[PDB]
Amino acid sequence: EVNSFSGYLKLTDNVYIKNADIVEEAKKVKPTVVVNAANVYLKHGGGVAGALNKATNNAMQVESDDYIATNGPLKVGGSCVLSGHNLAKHCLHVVGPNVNKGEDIQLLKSAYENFNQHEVLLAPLLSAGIFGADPIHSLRVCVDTVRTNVYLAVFDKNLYDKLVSSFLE
Numbered sequence: 265e266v267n268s269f270s271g272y273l274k275l276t277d278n279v280y281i282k283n284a285d286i287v288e289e290a291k292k293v294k295p296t297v298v299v300n301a302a303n304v305y306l307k308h309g310g311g312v313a314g315a316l317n318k319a320t321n322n323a324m325q326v327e328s329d330d331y332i333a334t335n336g337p338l339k340v341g342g343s344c345v346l347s348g349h350n351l352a353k354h355c356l357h358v359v360g361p362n363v364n365k366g367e368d369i370q371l372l373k374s375a376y377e378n379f380n381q382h383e384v385l386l387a388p389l390l391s392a393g394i395f396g397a398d399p400i401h402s403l404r405v406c407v408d409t410v411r412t413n414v415y416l417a418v419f420d421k422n423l424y425d426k427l428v429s430s431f432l433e
C-alpha cells in the first residue's frame with residue numbers, strides 16, 4: 265500500500281521509468297512525493313502542471329497562489345514543498361529551465377538536485393516537452409544527479425522507447 269509502483273523498468277539502482285501518465289500514476293500509487301514540472305510563479309496553465317492541478321480540482325492552484333503571495337516566485341532550478349492533495353502526501357514543485365524561453369540548460373542539474381531531499385519520488389522528465397530540453401540529455405542529468413529513489417513517468421511510448429534504448433547503449 266505504500267509507494268506501490270508497478271510496471272517500472274529499473275535503469276540504475278535508484279532510477280526507474282515507465283510509459284505512463286504521471287496523474288494516473290499518482291492516483292494509483294499515492295506516493296509520498298509527486299514532482300510537478302512548475303514555473304516560477306506556480307501558474308499551472310497547461311502540460312504536466314495543468315494536468316496535476318486539474319486532478320486536484322484546482323486546489324493546487326489556490327494553494328500555489330497563496331504560497332507566491334507570501335514568499336514570492338521561485339528561482340529557475342529551485343523548488344518548494346506544498347500539499348500533495350489527493351495525489352500524494354506532498355507535491356515538490358520544481359522549476360527546470362525552459363530552453364525555448366532562453367533559460368540556461370545548466371540549471372537542469374540544480375533542478376534535479378531538489379529531488380535529493382526526498383527518499384522516494386514520482387516525477388516527470390524535467391524540462392522535456394514544450395520546455396525544449398533534449399529529453400535524452402534530461403534523463404542523463406537525472407541519472408547522474410539524483411541519489412534518492414526516483415520513478416519517472418513519461419506519457420509517450422515513442423519517447424519512452426527512445427529513452428530506454430539511449431540508456432542501454
Ligand SMILES: CC(C)[C@H](Nc1ncnc2[nH]c(-c3cn[nH]c3)cc12)c1ccc2c(c1)S(=O)(=O)CCC2
Pocket residue numbers: 284285286287301310311312313315388389390391392393394395399417418419420423
Ligand atoms: C515529454 C512529454 C511526453 C511529458 N508529458 C507527460 N509526462 C508524464 N505525464 C504526463 N501527463 C500528461 C497529461 C495528462 N493529461 N494531460 C496531459 C502529460 C505528461 C512531459 C515531461 C515534462 C514536461 C512536459 C511534458 S510539458 O510539455 O508539460 C512542459 C514541462 C516539462
